[PDB]
């Protein structure tokens, strides 16, 4: 029988959408890319255009220098052998300097100086990309929620690779660039601090992650169930409430006794998501700097 709106039945296309101008410098906008019919079954078919100013270029050259630096080490660990490289891909690892070196930049390339260089390029990449999330919003007249949310992610990333090591007194506390190595680090970090299940901020972090999945499932499901009334046109439902927004609200009111608004749900969503990395970064930053063992900490309720 009936149709569910997970995939489109019919695509339509017209001239490529170059976008709103507002205060964007159009010189820095590429041109449209291909249209992907595959993508179109699910979302939009139009690829591009993208905006590449100075920050963008910097961000992305730096991002590649990070990736190429890690990759150059991978080949070296492979003794330049293409077969070994693919075989051992998930085992290679770019490790930070040893404790010996503390926080200094003294360490030889093969003993973690290369990790410092990779880390330098990544730091430029991410912060400049951050600067980009803010500016591309500024140029369009939009609020800066995106930059503020991305900052929550950054916080966790900074805590792991930069702030915590600094406070701990050595780069060897940081995370190695490798697939398996980074999971071993993670496991070993929990063991070494008494199991992070006893870290109350870890427990929150989990609550919000799981919560993020429930909320997006609820929200997405909800919007699809009222998309036969135009529900996905969220910004106009905010400006002039229609029956989509009302049936949404009422589904939930009747189900769990309270509900949201078409705008407010997006606030629940931004905060549910950002509290994951927000609580997480704190839990981590406290670990070893202030608390050597969360079980023991927990035994004194604090």
């Amino acid at each position: 029988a009936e149709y569910q709106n997970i995939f489109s039945q019919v695509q339509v296309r017209g001239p490529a959408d170059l976008g709103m101008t507002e205060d964007v410098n159009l010189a820095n906008r590429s041109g449209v890319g291909p249209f992907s019919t595959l993508l179109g079954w699910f979302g939009n078919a139009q690829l591009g255009p993208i905006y590449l100013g100075s920050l963008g270029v910097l961000s992305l050259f730096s991002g590649l220098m990070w990736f190429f630096t890690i990759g150059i080490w991978f080949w070296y660990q492979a003794g330049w052998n293409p077969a070994v490289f693919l075989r051992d891909l998930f085992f290679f690892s770019l490790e930070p300097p040893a404790p010996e070196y503390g926080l200094s930049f003294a360490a030889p390339l093969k003993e973690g100086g290369l990790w410092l260089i990779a880390s330098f390029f990544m730091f430029v990449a991410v912060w400049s990309w951050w600067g980009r999330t803010y500016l591309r919003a500024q140029a369009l007249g939009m609020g800066k929620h995106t930059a503020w949310a991305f900052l929550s992610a950054i916080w966790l990333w900074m805590v792991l690779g930069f702030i915590r090591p600094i406070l701990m007194g050595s780069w060897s506390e940081a995370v190695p660039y490798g697939i398996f190595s980074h999971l071993d680090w993670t496991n070993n970090f929990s063991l070494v601090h008494g199991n992070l299940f006893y870290n109350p901020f870890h427990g929150l972090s989990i609550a919000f992650l799981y919560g993020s999945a429930a909320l997006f499932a609820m929200h997405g499901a909800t919007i699809l169930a009222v998309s036969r009334f135009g529900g996905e046109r969220e910004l106009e439902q905010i400006a002039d409430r229609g029956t989509a927004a009302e049936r949404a609200a009422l589904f939930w009111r009747w189900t769990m006794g309270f509900n949201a608004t078409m705008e407010g749900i997006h606030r629940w969503a931004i905060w549910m998501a950002v509290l994951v990395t927000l609580t997480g970064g704190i839990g981590i930053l406290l670990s070893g700097t202030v608390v050597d063992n969360w079980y023991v900490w927990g035994q004194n309720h604090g």
């Binding site: 019919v10 078919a45 905060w271 704190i282």
Partner: protein, 240 residues
């Protein structure tokens, strides 16, 4: 110690947040009312927040919420019981009267505009140069209702220009007029479009748009409302 303080603080912040979030979500529908329209005695422990004001593009003015609430329309329903909490019975034809799952909101009787101030939704024929890019073109197919009777034929797709997606099929009835059907309520099959929500006799009662080539938020609501309402109210003529 610092961790105690950090964690204690965080619960405090988190209660503040839940309060901001809960109150923000009372910018519509509040104050709570009794079944006759008057304000309810108990509104709960959260107050209404200080109003905020959305400036709307294209001289459409502002929206300020919270503010005076009201249906701005009649509601053909009546109580079926002597206390709060029971269903309200349609006093007429709930499809024609726009109640129940056939409900509509008195939204503004203008069209959604795009970022350029142009009508967001147009029939494909007036949208240069839109066209079906994949899937089976429904234009030309007969349209079958849940009674398994042919109710018309598809004469165009109405499309959302900026987002480039099909929003409605325009269908033509025995009498030569058309109606819009929401895209999300039809199955395009190889040799027909099937519409489970409506039996063939109810296509004439689809609210009709005042201009052949635009559609307003008010009208989209009546159309989408009427069609969905058929799920419940046309079940005596569906069928399988």
């Amino acid at each position: 110690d610092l961790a105690s303080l950090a964690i204690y603080s965080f619960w405090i912040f988190l209660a503040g947040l839940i309060y901001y979030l809960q109150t923000e979500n009372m910018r519509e529908g509040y104050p709570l009312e009794n079944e006759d329209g008057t304000p309810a005695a108990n509104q709960g422990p959260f107050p209404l927040p200080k109003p905020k004001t959305f400036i709307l593009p294209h001289g459409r003015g502002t929206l300020t919420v919270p503010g005076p609430e009201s249906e701005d329309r009649p509601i053909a329903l009546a109580r079926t019981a002597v206390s709060e909490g029971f269903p309200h019975a349609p006093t007429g034809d709930p499809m024609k009267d726009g109640v129940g799952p056939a409900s509509w909101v008195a939204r503004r009787d203008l069209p959604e505009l795009d970022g350029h101030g142009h009508n967001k939704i147009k029939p494909m024929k007036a949208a240069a140069g839109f066209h079906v890019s994949a899937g089976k073109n429904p234009i030309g197919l007969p349209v079958r209702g849940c009674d398994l009777e042919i109710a018309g034929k598809v004469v165009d797709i109405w499309v959302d220009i900026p987002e480039q997606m099909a929003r409605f099929l325009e269908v033509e009835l025995k009498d030569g007029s058309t109606r819009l059907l929401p895209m999300q309520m039809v199955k395009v099959q190889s040799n027909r479009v099937h519409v489970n929500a409506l039996s063939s006799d109810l296509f004439a009662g689809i609210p009709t748009i005042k201009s052949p080539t635009e559609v307003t938020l008010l009208e989209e609501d009546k159309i989408c409302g009427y069609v969905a309402g058929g799920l419940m109210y046309a079940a005596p003529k569906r069928k399988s």
